[PDB]
Design an enzyme around this catalytic site. Structure first.
Site, PDB file in Angstrom:
ATOM      1  N   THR A   7      39.152  35.929  15.630  1.00  0.00           N
ATOM      2  CA  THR A   7      40.098  35.059  16.348  1.00  0.00           C
ATOM      3  C   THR A   7      41.539  35.521  16.165  1.00  0.00           C
ATOM      4  OG1 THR A   7      40.308  33.617  14.379  1.00  0.00           O
ATOM      5  CG2 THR A   7      38.589  33.023  16.013  1.00  0.00           C
ATOM      6  N   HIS A   8      42.442  34.980  16.986  1.00  0.00           N
ATOM      7  CA  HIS A   8      43.886  35.210  16.732  1.00  0.00           C
ATOM      8  C   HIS A   8      44.234  34.797  15.321  1.00  0.00           C
ATOM      9  CE1 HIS A   8      44.588  35.310  21.176  1.00  0.00           C
ATOM     10  NE2 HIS A   8      45.647  36.029  20.834  1.00  0.00           N
ATOM     11  N   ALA A   9      43.714  33.656  14.887  1.00  0.00           N
ATOM     12  CA  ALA A   9      44.015  33.163  13.537  1.00  0.00           C
ATOM     13  C   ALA A   9      43.555  34.137  12.433  1.00  0.00           C
ATOM     14  CB  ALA A   9      43.378  31.728  13.317  1.00  0.00           C
TER      15      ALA A   9
END
EC number: 3.1.-.-
Lengths: 84, 90, 83, 90
Positions: free
Chosen positions: D84-86
């Site tokens: 994910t981006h996170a």
């Protein structure tokens, strides 16, 4: 120390954006902080926030059709023809 | 060597920049890099494909609010527009 | 009439406001433009954040030849990854 | 005919995606486009250089919040990270 960003916004746009962001674990306020942090650091906008406007698009369409396009032999010739 | 082109709109945009006392060496130097096949461009230009579906079109930053839009293919380099975000996207 | 309201560091707010004022924009203009892009594309704008510590550590290891693995072709690769 | 590599972190990231029951065929399909030099990628992958000064590193989106980071040079394709981006930027 702590300030607030307050921005008028279309309520439907706000709801939709919040839904998109909620899927990735972000709030709208998270996105505001992240975006402003980037702007402050880079002293520039994030890429690609807006589509090219009507005048830019019209220039691209004309050029793609071969309308109002000009040739140059090299840099010197080009700068000369442009008057720069 | 790529063939070099510019649009009519490009000629108007450079005249406006000149009139607004922009530093024309910044733009001319970037134009020369493209003409000289300096690719990828130095990172400071933040060069990227133009937003949208315009094949071969790219967007480089002479300054944070001075953009050059150009088309680049194996055979062609065309200078399309230049100006502020407001002039090109606004 | 709705509003976006976000807590923010005062210095960060001032620096962004200065950058934007040079382009004829307010922070609230940038907020509307950015949320419009997110809403329309169902995705974030590019490059909002630098690669994080874990990503940087992996790149640094790989560039140094640490913990890097070869594969002969796609089938061999998928085999090695267990996919 | 690029050499193919993957990082240790990449194998861990792939195992994690697998446990989250992500659709592994989407990732495999992208990886195959890259291995076969089927470039440029389809527009849907939103492929772009990785943020920062990591030469040759690129960032493609398997989904809007499922990213692949890879290095691409004339001689080498290396799968570096995915998530994910996170997980990659957060």
């Amino acid at each position: 120390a702590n300030a607030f960003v307050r921005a008028r916004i279309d309520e439907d746009l706000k709801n939709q954006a919040a839904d998109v962001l909620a899927g990735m674990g972000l709030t709208i306020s998270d996105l505001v902080r992240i975006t402003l942090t980037k702007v402050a650091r880079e002293k520039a906008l994030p890429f690609d926030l807006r589509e090219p406007n009507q005048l830019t698009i019209q220039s691209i369409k004309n050029s793609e059709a071969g309308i109002d396009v000009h040739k140059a032999k090299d840099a010197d010739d080009l700068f000369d023809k442009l008057g720069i | 060597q790529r063939d070099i082109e510019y649009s009519g709109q490009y000629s108007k945009d450079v005249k406006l920049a000149q009139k607004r006392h922009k530093d024309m060496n910044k733009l001319k130097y970037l134009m020369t890099l493209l003409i000289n096949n300096t690719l990828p461009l130095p990172a400071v230009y933040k060069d990227h494909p133009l937003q949208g579906s315009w094949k071969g079109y790219r967007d480089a930053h002479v300054e944070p609010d001075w953009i050059l839009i150009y088309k680049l293919t194996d055979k062609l380099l065309r200078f399309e527009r230049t100006g502020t975000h407001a002039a090109l996207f606004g």
